[PDB]
Amino acid sequence: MNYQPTPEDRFTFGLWTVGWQGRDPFGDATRRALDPVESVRRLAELGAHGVTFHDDDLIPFGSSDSEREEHVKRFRQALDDTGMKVPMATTNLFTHPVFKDGGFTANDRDVRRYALRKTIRNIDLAVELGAETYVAWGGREGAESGGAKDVRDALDRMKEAFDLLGEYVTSQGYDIRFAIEPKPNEPRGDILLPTVGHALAFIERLERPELYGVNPEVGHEQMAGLNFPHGIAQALWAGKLFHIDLNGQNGIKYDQDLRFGAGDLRAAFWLVDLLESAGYSGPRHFDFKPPRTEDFDGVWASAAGCMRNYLILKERAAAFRADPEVQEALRASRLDELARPTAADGLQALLDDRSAFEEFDVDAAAARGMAFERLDQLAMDHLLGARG
Amino acid sequence: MNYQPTPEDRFTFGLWTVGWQGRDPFGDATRRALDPVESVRRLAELGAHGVTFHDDDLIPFGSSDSEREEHVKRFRQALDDTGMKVPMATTNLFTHPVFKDGGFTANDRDVRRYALRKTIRNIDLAVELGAETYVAWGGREGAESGGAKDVRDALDRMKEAFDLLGEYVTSQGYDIRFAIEPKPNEPRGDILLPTVGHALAFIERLERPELYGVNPEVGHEQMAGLNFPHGIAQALWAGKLFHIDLNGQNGIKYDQDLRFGAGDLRAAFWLVDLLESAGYSGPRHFDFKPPRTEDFDGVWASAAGCMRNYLILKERAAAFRADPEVQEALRASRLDELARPTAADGLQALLDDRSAFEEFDVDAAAARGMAFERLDQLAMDHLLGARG
Amino acid sequence: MNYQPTPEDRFTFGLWTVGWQGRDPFGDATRRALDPVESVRRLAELGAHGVTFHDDDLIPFGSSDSEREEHVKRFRQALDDTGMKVPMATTNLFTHPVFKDGGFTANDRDVRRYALRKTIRNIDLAVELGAETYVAWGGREGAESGGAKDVRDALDRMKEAFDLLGEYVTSQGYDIRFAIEPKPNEPRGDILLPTVGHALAFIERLERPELYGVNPEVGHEQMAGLNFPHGIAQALWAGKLFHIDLNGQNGIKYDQDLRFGAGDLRAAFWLVDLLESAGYSGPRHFDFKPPRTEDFDGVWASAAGCMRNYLILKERAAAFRADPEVQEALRASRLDELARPTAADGLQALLDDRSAFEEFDVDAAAARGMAFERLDQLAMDHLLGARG
Amino acid sequence: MNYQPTPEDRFTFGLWTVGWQGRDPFGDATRRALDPVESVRRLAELGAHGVTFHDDDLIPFGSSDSEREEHVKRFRQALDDTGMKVPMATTNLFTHPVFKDGGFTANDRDVRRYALRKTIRNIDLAVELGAETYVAWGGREGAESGGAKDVRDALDRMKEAFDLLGEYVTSQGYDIRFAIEPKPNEPRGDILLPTVGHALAFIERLERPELYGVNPEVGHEQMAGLNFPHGIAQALWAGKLFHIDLNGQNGIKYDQDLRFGAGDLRAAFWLVDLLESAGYSGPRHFDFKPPRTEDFDGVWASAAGCMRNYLILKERAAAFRADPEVQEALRASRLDELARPTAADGLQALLDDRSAFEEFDVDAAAARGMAFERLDQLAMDHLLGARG
């Protein structure tokens, strides 16, 4: 009825999102840089809960130890002044030329050691600022050509790096967990761990798998043509959805990072339905870029729209699930039977059950319609607010 | 020099590949059906090692117990007459209308029980014929719309089904392992476990994960725009490449199942390089469809081309890796350093190493070229046989 | 407020849409065949304006001249009984095995002559039934491999065929125009004239270009990742939008033919906005397939949803364009300036205008935001009915 | 046998290709800038025929009239010193922030006038340097959202701009023609005239269509999943292939601009076959970016590989077409019949020919295999140099 966000809705934004200056591979910046303190103050006014950062967003690369302490103290004063929190942080292992062949899986061993030391330094800072999750996006881990990267050796190096970071946080006694953010390509021709599935599988080979989960991004799974709500369901089923990046993407192309709600709107509806019905309690983080057509007024408009669209879709998904006509349709399509075990009676009783094979009437079962189109049109009517 | 296959090269083909009659979603069959016995005899003449089958390829659906025994005895005589083996089998849980919403994850519980009984019946037959691997492709597990399938409940049902099949083979004492074949879409709008990564992650949640691996198909990972050699490397790293389906695909579109070598030729080269250098010893199985433009002479031509193209690429990948100029290029691009541990000295020594951070010269490291373009042009010259 | 269609809304459906039996490349039919007369009666009850057909949907292939007249007279009685019209017809040049390498561009010359005679026979029947548009979808014109089809010779053959059909209708004095329906792939690996742009360009090389336009389909341009409203705008700008096929598609994959509104919902909104604001007056034709999960009740539900979703989106697009806040936003984003000529003053005056170059303040112009994100969030609020 | 290029092979390169500094949307430059004079000298040593440029590659933006004359005179001396030619030039209407919503179709009218004056200034310079073709890539013409751009008004503005440029060159008496370069997306969410087909159709609506053709780029049509050799065939059939940009792309993703031969190798083979057999006589221009992993030695290696791979593929395509076994296969697949008119006897004789319908044996025609798989395996053997 009213779609105004409050800090209770847990909306967070990266400093690099509203602060994106608009440089793209074919053009110069269209906006001046934003001071982090200014972004914190503006986002607080719009109803945000908190902000996230890469090390190099907060502390310019090369900074002396004294300049570092000064940048952090200004930031911390803005947080104290506004009540904003810092629930997640991450490391920039992709912008500087030294990371051109990767950080953790760079072929040069000295670069891999530097990447780990740069990361550990920022984990300490994140803990100090209260973050609960530390994200890793290995944007430069990958290759443009087949012989440049032995992927088995590279996964050994990736496992080695995350194992060492797990050793580090446990030896320091820190309460922080790691989340890997997959992306299939860009800026490398193919990036390692390209989808939520590949990241979940990798984590199971780590020495302390309980410290690691995923940080999926809407547009990145869509760059592989995959269904983002399905991949989130698999991450929830595994107990590994530690954080999430929300935005929009129009299909398979360069990573657009549009505001949330833009892109595939029906997928956004089914994602919000799933997060709210599964009781996801982490931050609703927006990793988006206000288009470079916009001035600063359009940056804040686009950030506000992220939050607005989540809250509209939350309302429509809740209306859908509460509608008694929809609940009857779900039974007509046998979603209740999907949730019942196939064979709680056990293997032997299944083998002995003639009604499951010898005397199963396949033709009668085949003729039963699933009634999915009526259910989906109810979902469409709810999304569009056209119910009668 | 000569590219003639022998049974030692372990090339296998599904009965459904050369026996595809050419029916597609817009047209009728263009070829008559092939008797399985005829396919076994023809494939043996071409140098194949063996064949694979779905239950319903070998025994027509509905078959009485007596017709069943007759179909199998004819098949077995053809195997004995030719020396052909049967290393893999699988179940058809996708053609009959009863499977229109899935087999293991159908919303109707009675269909899920029937799907398990149909599978178990064919596992017994596979063991009898000597198969070592039992493949599952869940082509109908999935959805066209968001509300039709709760994916968390569906993954519970999928895990329940594979857990019961594992219970079955272990209680029977059978030496057979399972391999899941991913596909991202088609015939369902989105299929569950859509990529090698999602399947590997799922397997780790099974009660007896050691019995399950993957059966990746070249064209299916390419339908998601992903790099198939990279996904195979991840499956090999996990110890889970139990079988493989070889074919060709021209990018993101319907599943073409072209002959191996067609489609993305450079990816085929890097796949053969990887399988041969990792010492993959399972079958080289072709899951392909001779185009419906062809008569039976073109079917056998297309099957022969599958094997020929593997053997040419095997030769060119071996020439590449043996060339001393390539070995020097690999060192110039630091592939040797990629295989060395980043920090065998351990965490504490890494933290104490000033050369890894405080005194690391990032600018000097950044200026080092990786020399990947020269290496990739050596790989291209080898593939095209243009070395001088 | 109420979304009930009437024949005045001009909604039409192909006989092959609601009559699709559910056979797909991996499974058997799940529905029995529908008698055309039954489909006409049911669609009339739902508020449809008319139906369209391929020759072989109405008259089974091989039909004797006497069976033919009988099938047509039954159909015509159903049309008379219901008030349903037949505004478009088309030819099936894709199902029968003889068309496996194409109809108009088959390499065999005798098949190309047969394809033309089969087409001409149905044009006469279409005129008799009152159709105004004759569609051609060359689903089999194309190739799976490079050497199979010289595309320059094939375009000569395609032009030859359409030129002969134009000669035929003009010599007969018929008032019917042709519309080419593009599709980029499936069932051939690549289809000729794969997008609206390629079809529009081809038409300009025909001997009588005024007789030919396009029949774009939502999901087909989306199978190439393209923006369907943009391609429709280009077809309208050229004066060539003779008919349109409405449906839904979830990105780049096999042709789903979902009901209209499903798939990319925001693109559907912008398409309806464009058709209604440009005053498109032809039929709103649905080329869709009710999913094979459905029984006949779900078929009619899915057909009804096509019409419902058009009417909801029509209402929301009209509300958007009528909102004075949106009209002010359009001026803020300078859509009014886009519609003014760049240089009605002419070339010489442009060259003499120092304000266009020598004294143009580029920095001041660059700093002007375009305000597109606020406009797009107004469009989102209107679509979701969340305006306040 | 030897693959050394000479200026006779007409290979050309943009200054922006070898001079790309490696800045991408997620990272800083990895190479220093190259002086244009140095690039001309190095490319001449490698066997190139000439170079191309944007205005802003040669003359830094903002340059005073005196600095301008100096930059051009240095360049011209390098051309004279090396024998290098300048066959094409183009305008940068995409890098500066003023072009953030387009050049010719920017919503702001003053920006559209500036874009035309910037273009005309560089056409004069191109003519002075001897260029024959002037390319336009409208990289910023397009939109991220639906309401931001009325595409019909934008195409009016695009036509207005190209009509004025045609007026300009004709009134000046210049012998130069224009070529539009399509791209479907990036950096805008959708770009206008996204494919070769849309550009060819647009040109037919210009006032003097004979002055305009296309400049297709391999990777751009592949970003839409389309077959680049087919689109080139359509451009050749229309008489509109005025220039071509050669490079490589691995499927549907961001524009990679890899060296020619990388990406889809079989498509490169069929493209070279087509250009050489159609007798394309324009420049073989490489629009590529040496990956940012490389130092300057890798830049020159990658440029050399462009030329090498064209010359290898030229040899293999010529061997294919000259092989008598291939010529017999082409007849077996009836490529000779494809080139014969379908009905040179005319419409009336076709209607009177009972052998084309009443007495056509469709079943006999349908059973004829097309023998395309054998032909395609001959093409594969030739490409890989595996003929015996």
Ligand SMILES: OC[C@@H]1O[C@@H](O)[C@@H](O)[C@H]1O
């Ligand atoms: O730019 C690095 C930020 O961190 C990750 O979330 C990325 O997706 C990206 O937006």
Ligand SMILES: OC[C@@H]1O[C@@H](O)[C@@H](O)[C@H]1O
């Ligand atoms: O048709 C079912 C066969 O089994 C699986 O390997 C599928 O990919 C398919 O080719």
Ligand SMILES: OC[C@@H]1O[C@@H](O)[C@@H](O)[C@H]1O
């Ligand atoms: O099946 C042939 C019908 O005619 C065309 O409109 C196609 O898109 C299709 O739906």
Ligand SMILES: OC[C@@H]1O[C@@H](O)[C@@H](O)[C@H]1O
């Ligand atoms: O960067 C602008 C150059 O000109 C055009 O050819 C583009 O494709 C591009 O490489």
Ligand code: NI
């Ligand atoms: Ni992103």
Ligand code: NI
């Ligand atoms: Ni992100």
Ligand code: NI
């Ligand atoms: Ni396949």
Ligand code: NI
């Ligand atoms: Ni397979």
Ligand code: NI
């Ligand atoms: Ni379609």
Ligand code: NI
């Ligand atoms: Ni259609």
Ligand code: NI
């Ligand atoms: Ni490009």
Ligand code: NI
């Ligand atoms: Ni280009």
